[PDB]
Design a protein around this ligand. Structure first.
Ligand SMILES: *[C@@H]1O[C@H](CO)[C@@H](O[C@@H]2O[C@H](CO)[C@@H](O[C@@H]3O[C@H](CO)[C@@H](O)[C@H](O)[C@@H]3O)[C@H](O)[C@H]2NC(C)=O)[C@H](O)[C@H]1NC(C)=O
Ligand SMILES: *[C@@H]1O[C@H](CO)[C@@H](O[C@@H]2O[C@H](CO)[C@@H](O[C@@H]3O[C@H](CO)[C@@H](O)[C@H](O)[C@@H]3O)[C@H](O)[C@H]2NC(C)=O)[C@H](O)[C@H]1NC(C)=O
Lengths: 949, 243
């Protein structure tokens, strides 16, 4: 069935991290475009279409980061981690050309050195160790130590085609040393010692220009150093009197030097960064400096070369422009419009054909990085492509001249997803009309009869129009966004750690709306909640979003719409310390909206929907709401409760020693979960009642010390209402990542054993006795009983990166467990197999009712593979949403990519079977009528003949 | 009420199954009428059949008979000297109402075609021991037994229209000339078995066991009475004219 339905109602979108080191080489350039990111993924995009050709994922916890990347004519060289392992890739095809193991140093700089004709060695300089490797094969022969390395920082290694390798060493505040080696064999020729008290940093700053000319700017005395390392003896100071000497007070000037690797020589042109935004092209021949094209604004610049000519792209904030403190705005129609122009490097000419203009939609984003790919064509035409990078995470490509400036846009801000949710559509026009027509407050019999007659007349008119439409036939999705019989299309909201809100549709997968937050720093906590649903007409849907910072400690709350995107005009102020925690109140008031209250550091409750009836209901409940807070570094599990109006009081307190145990994860019970059967059958016919607790939290603690044998893994089952541990289970040889999933009454937690290299699977279940309690109103104040706890162990040969359970509205179908694998395939397995009621020896009644003999061996069947072809490189998490029919759950797996499907718990029992031939049924139905009509006359004539004869 | 079902499954299952069972019943009835064949009849068997009918009407209606003629008839039938019954002597798979096999076959084919289906739920609360009866193709243990499959739907459908079939059909009584022939045919079809001797002896002894009670002697009841019906009757005969 899966091979028949390949891509009917499923879709996957592949994404890439933020562009860090991208190259726009490949003079042939069919479609090749290399991108290496800051998430240890290296991809190849296509210039024409934009799809992924080949992509590689290695790491992403703390290691494998890309430091530098070089590009040859056909091959790419890159360094991962921090200077330990290096590997080279290809671009025509994709795979590894060669690999090399480095030494134990601190990666600082790399370069290409060419003996006489072309590059054959790559120079890699570490903090103290220096080496050179080959480019075709992998061999290390050139490696040696420099004279002084302790109080010396080596950066910006420059190489020449003559055959001399130069190394620059600048200390924080003392002296500077330039050292030189040969290429044939490591031999120190001579060392140059230059005194510079105003030279602090050299990592990003000074460059090499002309033929081994060192240039260093300074705003202290506002002057330039130029020195010759090839010849001459000492430095020479250039005061700046021919140029407009304007250096920013608190800004260290930057140089932009260019030197093509294939060409042995270098150029004598470079840009100087002044102030926030002040670029200028200056040329230095021997001692005299020529300045031209004094760029006034010039937000961004880029260099490029294709042959013997060099081009510089200048990107300005033009279009009626009006410049603010730091941002730029155009006051004509669209605002935030930028232009890109080309300029000569030798001279200062400006191309008349080159003029790119483009504007953005969102406000706040400003260009950060930009590349240029200029290629010669025809005889008197220059074409180039610019890749402007958006401020947060977004890629954009522009064409020289065409109908639309924007060719392809790829959203790189949808990789890291923090919180996610799904909401439904408002209504349907005919359905809403029927709902409004039925609405009656107080009327008589005559009024209802008249309303029924009017509805019947409307239905008749609609039927007549429909009949007319079929008789005639016989002869923007945002605007409609309608529902249907089975609500499978839902509007999902994605929140990024960067601070961008995304809205995608479950059916197509096209971006409907995208909004940007003012300012969001890393390590920020997000939480999205839905207060007002879409089923009710009278006020627009309300969606609440809490965000808080970790370093500074501010908390803000936003009220936006998940359907359109525009935020409402209701927003509460936040004061005192950052908001601690919040819960969603099931009770509804005002119109049809629920109540949300939050806790501050002062231990006070703050209500978002300030309403007299809200406060009246809250005061009526009063001792009905409890609060448990869990701390990791403090190791204190203390509880509070509301008293009378608004006040915090301690009720139950728990402390755990941090040195022995450490909190890892805490899971609870989902608010939207209904149980169909409250008991189970047993051997003969006797019933067995379960133990369902709506208020119960499970905490997971791990050992602080890590040893081969000494490992402590345990789980505590506590009630958040009253401090009381139900069951506390402890392991003895468990360590590593621990995953816990909570459900109706069974807990599924996985671990890894150090003694025997394996992953053990423990399933815990709570069961009551044969007799039931009150069973009319549940409360944790009463019920002084201890439920039975059942444990079993299995073997799972995988890592279990992600884990979830399929949750339905009513809960009449099966309960499948979805588990992700490092491969990317997601496997769903039934809870029946992992049942605690698994007798060891096969007994009569157990095998008679419904049971399989217990055996600790679980094999991964290839048939139970939801992911047939589409795989997820990194499985951060999966979200399961209950559909509306009965047995359908929408599963969306997020992470490096996005993928959505529908999972079937137990085949299908709600929709017609696909293989239902209507020809046979219709033929039989017509044949029965034909046969009865045939045999009627036969019976009549038989009766008549018998009567006559 | 739960388990929201499609509107396009009710139009392709319920109406088809209803029409199928209705017209299958009609086909069975009309084919049974067609396959009915007459039985050969010998004049002798008709003769003793009518003799038996005569003895039966003598037994039933014998009160309104002169006593002398009654004993004359009884002697003629008995006649210990010769007797007509005594001398006149002659010489001497498991298909059982096949209607269950066709309905079973039709239900089996209907269930085979529809593997996993939910036709309709029954309001009547049913136990969980009938779940293997009803679903037979659905893998659900938490579901109630109310939701039945197409097999039980058709099984209840065949009995639902059992009394409806007789509403459209009925009995016939015409062909006065052929009525007598029908009576002879059915009566001799009763008298098919070849046990003439024992039947004759049984009738011979039964006829002796009958007594005689002349119902004509009770004439005095009518003489002392009132004749008023004969003028309310006579008043309603006058208005009608002559065509
Ligand atoms: C099982 O739990 C339910 C819910 O807690 C119990 O029903 C409730 O029982 C209380 C105490 O009998 C009832 O309170 C009554 O309030 C009236 C005034 O409203 C007062 O006059 C009475 O003296 C009594 O205090 C409460 O109404 C009742 N609720 C319902 C919905 O019936 C039930 O008794 C428990 N059963 C067992 C066996 O524990
Ligand atoms: C996993 O994905 C690959 C693609 O990357 C699948 O290979 C391609 O599969 C499609 C169908 O899924 C083939 O398309 C077929 O094309 C023929 C005409 O050539 C057409 O008549 C068919 O109706 C169908 O559209 C495509 O040829 C095929 N490509 C290759 C190189 O084999 C692969 O089958 C997928 N794995 C599965 C389905 O297990």
């Amino acid at each position: 069935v899966y091979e028949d339905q390949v891509g009917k109602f499923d879709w996957r979108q592949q994404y890439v991290g933020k562009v860090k080191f991208a190259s726009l080489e490949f003079s042939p350039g069919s479609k090749k475009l290399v991108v290496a990111t800051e998430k240890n993924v290296i991809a190849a995009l296509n210039s024409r279409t934009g799809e992924i050709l080949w992509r590689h994922v290695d790491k992403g916890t703390a290691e494998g980061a890309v430091d530098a990347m070089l590009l040859h004519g056909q091959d790419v060289i890159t360094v991962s981690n921090g200077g330990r392992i290096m590997r080279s890739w290809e671009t025509n095809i994709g795979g590894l050309n060669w690999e090399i193991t480095l030494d134990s140093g601190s990666f600082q700089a790399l370069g290409l050195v060419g003996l006489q004709e072309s590059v054959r060695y790559i120079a890699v300089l570490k903090k103290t160790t220096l080496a050179l490797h080959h480019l075709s094969s992998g061999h290390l022969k050139w490696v040696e130590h420099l004279p002084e390395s302790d109080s010396i920082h080596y950066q910006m290694v420059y190489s020449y085609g003559s055959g001399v390798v130069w190394a620059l060493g600048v200390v924080p505040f003392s002296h500077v040393n330039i050292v030189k080696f040969n290429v044939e064999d490591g031999e120190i020729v001579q060392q140059v010692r230059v005194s510079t008290p105003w030279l602090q940093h050299l990592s990003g700053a000074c460059g090499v220009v002309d033929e081994a000319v060192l240039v260093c700017p300074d705003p202290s005395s506002r002057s330039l150093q130029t020195l010759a390392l090839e010849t001459e003896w000492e430095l020479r100071q250039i005061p700046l009197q021919s140029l407009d000497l304007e250096f920013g007070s608190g800004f260290q000037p930057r140089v932009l030097p260019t030197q093509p690797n294939p060409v042995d020589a270098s150029r004598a042109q470079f840009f100087l960064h002044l102030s926030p935004s002040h670029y200028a092209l200056l040329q230095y021949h021997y001692g005299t400096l020529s300045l031209l094209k004094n760029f006034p604004q010039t937000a961004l610049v880029s260099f490029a070369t294709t042959g013997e000519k060099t081009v510089a792209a200048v990107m300005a904030c033009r279009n009626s422009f009006s410049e603010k403190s730091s941002s730029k705005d155009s006051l004509a129609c669209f605002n935030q419009t930028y232009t890109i122009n080309l300029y000569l490097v030798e001279t200062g000419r400006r191309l008349l054909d080159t003029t790119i203009t483009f504007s953005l939609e969102q406000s706040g984003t400003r260009p950060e990085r930009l590349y240029i790919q200029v290629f010669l064509k025809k005889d008197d035409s220059v074409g180039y492509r610019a890749l402007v990078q958006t401020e947060d995470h977004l890629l954009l490509f522009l064409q020289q001249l065409a109908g639309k400036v924007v060719l392809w846009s790829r959203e790189e801000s949808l990789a890291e997803v923090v919180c996610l949710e799904m909401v439904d559509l408002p209504l349907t026009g005919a359905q809403a009309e029927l709902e409004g027509e039925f609405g009656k407050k107080a009327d008589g019999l005559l009024g209802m009869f008249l309303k029924r007659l009017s509805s019947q007349l409307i239905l008749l008119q609609a039927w007549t129009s429909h009949l007319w439409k079929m008789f005639y036939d016989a002869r923007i999705n945002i605007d409609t966004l309608a529902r249907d019989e089975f609500n499978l299309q839902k509007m999902m909201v994605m929140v990024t750690a960067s601070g961008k809100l995304f809205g995608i549709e479950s059916s197509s997968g096209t971006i409907l709306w995208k909004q940007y937050l003012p300012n969001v720093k890393p390590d920020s906590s997000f939480k999205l909640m839905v207060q007002r649903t879409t089923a009710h007409f009278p006020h627009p849907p309300q969606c609440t979003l809490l965000v808080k910072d970790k370093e500074s400690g501010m908390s803000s709350l936003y009220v936006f719409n998940p359907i359109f995107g525009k935020w409402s005009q209701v927003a509460p102020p936040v004061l005192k310390r950052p908001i601690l925690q919040s819960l969603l109140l099931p009770v509804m008031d005002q119109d049809y909206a629920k109540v949300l209250l939050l806790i501050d550091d002062e231990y006070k409750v703050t209500a978002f929907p300030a309403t007299r009836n809200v406060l009246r209901q809250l005061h009526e409940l009063a001792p009905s709401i409890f609060f448990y807070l869990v701390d990791a570094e403090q190791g204190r599990l203390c509880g509070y409760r509301l008293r009378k109006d608004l006040t915090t009081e301690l009720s139950w307190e728990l402390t755990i020693p941090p040195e022995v145990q450490r909190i890892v994860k805490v899971k609870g019970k989902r608010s939207s979960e209904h149980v169909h059967s409250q008991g189970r059958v047993m051997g003969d016919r006797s019933v067995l009642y379960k133990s369902l607790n709506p208020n119960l939290l499970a905490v997971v603690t791990e050992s602080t010390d890590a040893h081969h044998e000494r490992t402590f893994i345990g789980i505590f089952l506590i009630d958040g209402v009253t401090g009381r541990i139900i069951h506390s289970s402890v392991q003895k040889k468990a360590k590593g990542p621990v995953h816990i999933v909570h459900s109706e009454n069974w807990v599924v937690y996985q671990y890894w054993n150090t003694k025997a290299r394996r992953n053990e699977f423990t399933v815990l279940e709570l069961y009551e006795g044969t007799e039931q309690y009150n069973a009319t109103a549940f409360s944790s104040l009463d019920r002084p009983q201890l439920p039975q706890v059942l444990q079993q162990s299995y073997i799972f040969p995988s890592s279990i990166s992600a884990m979830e359970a399929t949750i339905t509205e009513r809960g009449i179908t099966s309960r499948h467990l979805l588990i992700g694998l490092p491969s990317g395939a997601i496997l769903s397995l039934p809870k029946a197999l992992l049942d605690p009621r698994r007798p060891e020896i096969p007994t009569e009644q157990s095998r008679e009712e419904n049971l399989i003999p217990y055996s600790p061996d679980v094999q991964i069947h290839a048939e139970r593979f939801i992911n047939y072809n589409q795989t997820v490189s990194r499985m951060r998490g999966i979200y399961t949403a209950p559909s509306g029919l009965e047995s359908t759950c929408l599963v969306v797996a997020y992470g490096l990519d996005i993928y959505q499907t529908r999972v079937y718990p137990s085949k299908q029992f709600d929709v017609l079977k696909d293989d239902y031939d209507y020809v046979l049924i219709s033929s039989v139905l017509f044949g029965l009528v034909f046969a009865t009509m045939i045999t009627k006359r036969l019976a009549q004539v038989k009766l008549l003949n018998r009567a006559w004869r | 009420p739960e388990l929201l079902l499609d509107s396009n499954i009710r139009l392709w299952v319920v109406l088809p199954i209803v029409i199928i069972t209705f017209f299958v019943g009609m086909i069975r009835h009309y084919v049974s009428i067609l396959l009915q064949s007459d039985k050969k009849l010998t004049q002798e068997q008709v003769s003793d059949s009518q003799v038996l009918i005569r003895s039966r009407v003598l037994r039933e209606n014998g009160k309104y008979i002169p006593k002398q003629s009654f004993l004359t008839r009884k002697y003629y039938f008995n006649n210990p000297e010769d007797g007509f019954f005594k001398k006149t002597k002659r010489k001497v798979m498991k298909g059982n109402v096949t209607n269950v096999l066709p309905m079973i076959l039709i239900g089996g084919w209907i269930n085979m075609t529809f593997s996993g289906f939910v036709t309709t739920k029954v309001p009547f609360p049913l136990t969980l021991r009938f779940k293997p009866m009803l679903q037979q193709g659905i893998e659900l243990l938490t579901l109630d037994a109310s939701w039945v499959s197409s097999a039980s739907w058709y099984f209840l459908n065949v009995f639902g229209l059992r009394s409806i079939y007789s509403l459209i059909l009925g009995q016939d009584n015409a062909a006065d000339q052929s009525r007598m022939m029908q009576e002879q045919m059915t009566g001799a079809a009763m008298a098919m078995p070849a046990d003439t001797n024992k039947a004759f002896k049984t009738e011979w002894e039964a006829l002796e066991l009958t007594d005689h009670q002349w119902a004509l002697d009770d004439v005095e009841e009518e003489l002392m009475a009132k004749d008023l019906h004969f003028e309310g009757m006579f008043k309603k005969e006058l208005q009608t004219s002559i065509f």
